[PDB]
UniProtKB/Swiss-Prot annotation, chains A, B:
Belongs to the multisubunit FA complex composed of FANCA, FANCB, FANCC, FANCE, FANCF, FANCG, FANCL/PHF9 and FANCM. The complex is not found in FA patients. In complex with FANCF, FANCG and FANCL, but not with FANCC, nor FANCE, interacts with HES1; this interaction may be essential for the stability and nuclear localization of FA core complex proteins. The complex with FANCC and FANCG may also include EIF2AK2 and HSP70. Interacts with FAAP20/C1orf86; interaction is direct. DNA repair protein that may operate in a postreplication repair or a cell cycle checkpoint function. May be involved in interstrand DNA cross-link repair and in the maintenance of normal chromosome stability. It is linked to Fanconi anemia, complementation group A: A disorder affecting all bone marrow elements and resulting in anemia, leukopenia and thrombopenia. It is associated with cardiac, renal and limb malformations, dermal pigmentary changes, and a predisposition to the development of malignancies. At the cellular level it is associated with hypersensitivity to DNA-damaging agents, chromosomal instability (increased chromosome breakage) and defective DNA repair. The chain holds residues 897 to 946 of 1455 of the full protein. It is found in: Nucleus; Cytoplasm. Phosphorylation is required for the formation of the nuclear complex. Not phosphorylated in cells derived from groups A, B, C, E, F, G, and H. It comes from the Eukaryota. The lineage of its organism: Eukaryota, Metazoa, Chordata, Craniata, Vertebrata. This is Fanconi anemia group A protein.
Length: 50, 50
């Protein structure tokens, strides 16, 4: 669904969307351990979302 | 090592100077362990002088 209400609502609405969950069942995208490691390595502590 | 050697020499001159040492003796200025802790906690992991 396109409607650009906000960011949080868009993210969660895409999250609950069916076809999106269907895509995640073929494991080229399941975010393996090492992948997550790399992605969290890229972030710095100076800037801070968490 | 650190930025301008002039500030370093100023700090050393003040540190070695006598009346500095005689002031250092009588005790509330003596950096309680808790105060050291408070200050080292105040600083961050982001801007790290060391």
């Amino acid at each position: 669904h396109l409607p650009s209400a906000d960011w949080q609502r868009a993210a969660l609405s895409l999250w609950t969307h069916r076809t999106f969950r269907e895509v995640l069942k073929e494991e080229d995208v399941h975010l393996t351990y090492q992948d997550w490691l790399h992605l969290e390595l890229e972030i710095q502590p100076e800037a801070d979302a968490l």
